[PDB]
Amino acid sequence: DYTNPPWNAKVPVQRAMQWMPISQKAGAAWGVDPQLITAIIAIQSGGNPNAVSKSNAIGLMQLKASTSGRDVYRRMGWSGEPTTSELKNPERNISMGAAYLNILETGPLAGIEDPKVLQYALVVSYANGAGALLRTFSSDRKKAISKINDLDADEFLEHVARNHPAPQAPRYIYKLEQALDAM
Ligand SMILES: CC(=O)N[C@@H]1[C@@H](O)[C@H](O[C@@H]2O[C@H](CO)[C@@H](O[C@@H]3O[C@H](CO)[C@@H](O[C@@H]4O[C@H](CO)[C@@H](O[C@@H]5O[C@H](CO)[C@@H](O)[C@H](O)[C@H]5NC(C)=O)[C@H](O)[C@H]4NC(C)=O)[C@H](O)[C@H]3NC(C)=O)[C@H](O)[C@H]2NC(C)=O)[C@@H](CO)O[C@H]1O
Numbered sequence: 001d002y003t004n005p006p007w008n009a010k011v012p013v014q015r016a017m018q019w020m021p022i023s024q025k026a027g028a029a030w031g032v033d034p035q036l037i038t039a040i041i042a043i044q045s046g047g048n049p050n051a052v053s054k055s056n057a058i059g060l061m062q063l064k065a066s067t068s069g070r071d072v073y074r075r076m077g078w079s080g081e082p083t084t085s086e087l088k089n090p091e092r093n094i095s096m097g098a099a100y101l102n103i104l105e106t107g108p109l110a111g112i113e114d115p116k117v118l119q120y121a122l123v124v125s126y127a128n129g130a131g132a133l134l135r136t137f138s139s140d141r142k143k144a145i146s147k148i149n150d151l152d153a154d155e156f157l158e159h160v161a162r163n164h165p166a167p168q169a170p171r172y173i174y175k176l177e178q179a180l181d182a183m
């Protein structure tokens, strides 16, 4: 079960919460819930702005320059990818994570009607990629979206746990709720 072992959110969220003024700024800029941002901070770095994963996901929202970093630079009208030092900077890190969430909402996940389903799809896509999420429904992006829209948030989570090739995928939703409950 993707909820084992249990995940206590109180501390990660407490530390995440220290970044709220930045998350508010980033969120307002990109049309993203600052609590959604904070929960992602808590789950991914536990609020450590200097954290670097074994796969080079960097900073508070654990962005990978070669994937999310590139997509955000593209969205800004820029070439290339952000540096590791830029991704360690709290403001630049949160602003880019917020931008990535908006990119996901407006691109691959466009059309998802239920706000809770969309929230869940955003976190799973953020963590394991929109392409991977969509492929658990269809090879056609918008048929995938049509299928997602047949589901409620609980069914959506069930489908992810049942079909997603990465076991961690539904665990991100479990921790998401843990974090939201601590806030
Ligand atoms: C150690 C610690 O402190 N914490 C760790 C924690 O880091 C670990 O989790 C890690 O989290 C990060 C996210 O925060 C994971 O990063 C994910 O990884 C995804 C899979 O590679 C990645 O998905 C890819 O995103 C690309 C860019 O959007 C997609 O390509 C794009 O597709 C578009 C069409 O949909 C296309 O138009 C674009 O042109 C194209 N862009 C580019 C540049 O190619 C790509 O399709 C997609 N992959 C798939 C399969 O769908 C996410 O972007 C990325 N998110 C971010 C925000 O960077 C990271 O992988 C996690 N690590 C691991 C090992 O899983 C965690 C362990 O899980 O442990 C904690 O302790």
Ligand SMILES: [Cl-]
Pocket (backbone or CB within 6 Å): 131, 132, 133, 135, 165
């Ligand atoms: Cl996949």
